[PDB]
């Protein structure tokens, strides 16, 4: 059996979208990753209990000037990962508005995950785990804290999404 899933990453600029995709797909992390100006397309293939799973992944430009283009990438998506930065409350608020947009405008069957990224920066935390967990539970979102830098929960969040599709 082979399954293929269409996935999109959304979120404020600098939260770590490209770093997360790069860690999952290439096992790489770049401390000096440049801001995305044009959406990038990547694939990874994994094994999941009796199935070979291929991911098709859109890594969007997070800056607000590219907002109007986002539906090109999420309208056909089966799953989305909305990413925020645990060290910045404003990015968590922005993530909630991405979630709201998906709920109103993307497929009614979309699986929405929420990633609290940069969790390795524990001494710089702004958003408490419990607050994000409660928001996720209330809105039916698949929530994990992640680190592209250390790889913490990077494999885990993509695999959890695949299990639910």
Note the residues at the interface with ligand GNP (CB under 6 A). Answer: 13-19, 30-31, 33, 35-36, 61-63, 117-118, 120-121, 147-149
Q: Kindly state the tokens that stand for 63.
A: 């800056």
34 is in an annotated binding site: no
10 Å CB burial of residue 86 (0-12, 13-18, 19+) is buried
Give the residue closest to ligand GNP by C-beta. Answer: 62
Q: Rule CB under 5 A: say whether 36 interacts with Mg ion.
A: yes
Cα(30)–Cα(16) distance, rounded to whole angstroms? Answer: 10
d(C-alpha 153, C-alpha 156), whole Å: 5
Q: Kindly state whether residue 18 participates in binding Mg ion, applying the rule CB under 5 A.
A: yes
- Contact of 46 with 40, CB cutoff 8 Å: no
Name the segment binding Mg ion (CB under 5 A); options: 4-12, 29-37, 71-79, 87-95: 29-37
Distance, first Cα to last Cα, the chain: 14
Q: Is 67 annotated as a binding residue?
A: no
Q: 36 vs 78, which CB is nearer to Mg ion?
A: 36
Q: Is 155 in the site for Mg ion (CB under 5 A)?
A: no
- Residues forming contacts to Mg ion in the complex (CB under 5 A) are 17-18, 36
């Amino acid at each position: 059996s082979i399954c293929q899933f269409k996935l999109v990453l959304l979120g404020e600029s600098a939260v770590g979208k490209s770093s997360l995709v790069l860690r999952f797909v290439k096992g790489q992390f770049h401390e000096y990753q440049e801001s995305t100006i044009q959406a990038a397309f990547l694939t990874q293939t994994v094994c999941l209990d009796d199935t070979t799973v291929k991911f098709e992944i859109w890594d969007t430009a997070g800056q607000e000037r590219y907002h109007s283009l986002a539906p090109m990438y999420y309208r056909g998506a089966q799953a989305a990962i909305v990413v925020y930065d645990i060290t910045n409350t404003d990015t968590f608020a922005r993530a909630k508005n991405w979630v709201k947009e998906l709920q109103r405008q993307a497929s009614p069957n979309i699986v929405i995950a929420l990633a609290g990224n940069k969790a390795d920066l524990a001494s710089k935390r702004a958003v408490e785990f419990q607050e994000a967990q409660a928001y996720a539970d209330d809105n039916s979102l698949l929530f994990m804290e992640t680190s592209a830098k250390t790889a913490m929960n990077v494999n885990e969040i993509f695999m959890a999404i695949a299990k639910k599709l």
